[PDB]
Design a protein around this ligand. Structure first.
Ligand SMILES: COC[C@H]1O[C@@H]2O[C@H]3[C@H](O)[C@@H](OC)[C@@H](O[C@H]4[C@H](O)[C@@H](O)[C@@H](O[C@H]5[C@H](O)[C@@H](O)[C@@H](O[C@H]6[C@H](OC)[C@@H](O)[C@@H](O[C@H]7[C@H](OC)[C@@H](OC)[C@@H](O[C@H]8[C@H](O)[C@@H](OC)[C@@H](O[C@H]1[C@H](O)[C@H]2OC)O[C@@H]8CO)O[C@@H]7CO)O[C@@H]6CO)O[C@@H]5CO)O[C@@H]4CO)O[C@@H]3CO
Ligand SMILES: [Cu+2]
Length: 54
């Protein structure tokens, strides 16, 4: 119930395994967490310090 987060900052993917996201984008969590964007539906790793509980 606690696994929805929101991006605090924009992030641009660096690698083939991380996920880009925009500030305010919500992420469902499945230092680096596997997440699914609730905007794009894409799944990848995000830096956990860039998101906070939503
Ligand atoms: C037009 O479709 C009719 C569809 O309408 C209703 O769905 C709503 C949905 O309820 C609503 O959600 C609140 C919103 O959807 C948004 C998603 O919630 C959000 O996650 C995001 O979606 C992402 C996906 O997460 C990504 O996965 C990706 O999707 C693309 C697929 O990549 C996996 C790609 O393959 C392709 O999808 C095809 C699909 O193959 C997987 C194909 O299935 C045969 C076909 O889908 C049919 C579907 O079978 C059928 O189901 C009964 C029906 O679906 C309706 C929902 O039932 C209804 O629910 C209320 O029609 C579909 C279309 O014919 O076609 C798919 C499209 O080609 O393409 C995917 C799109 O890129 O990327 C998306 C977008 O980021 O964003 C969603 C909204 O943009 O809206 C939905 C309707 O648009
Ligand atoms: Cu929870």
């Amino acid at each position: 119930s606690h696994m929805t987060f929101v991006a605090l900052y924009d992030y641009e993917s660096r690698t083939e395994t991380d996920l880009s996201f925009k500030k305010g984008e919500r992420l469902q969590i499945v230092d680096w967490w596997l997440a699914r964007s609730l905007t794009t539906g894409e799944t990848g790793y995000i830096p956990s310090n860039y998101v906070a509980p939503s």
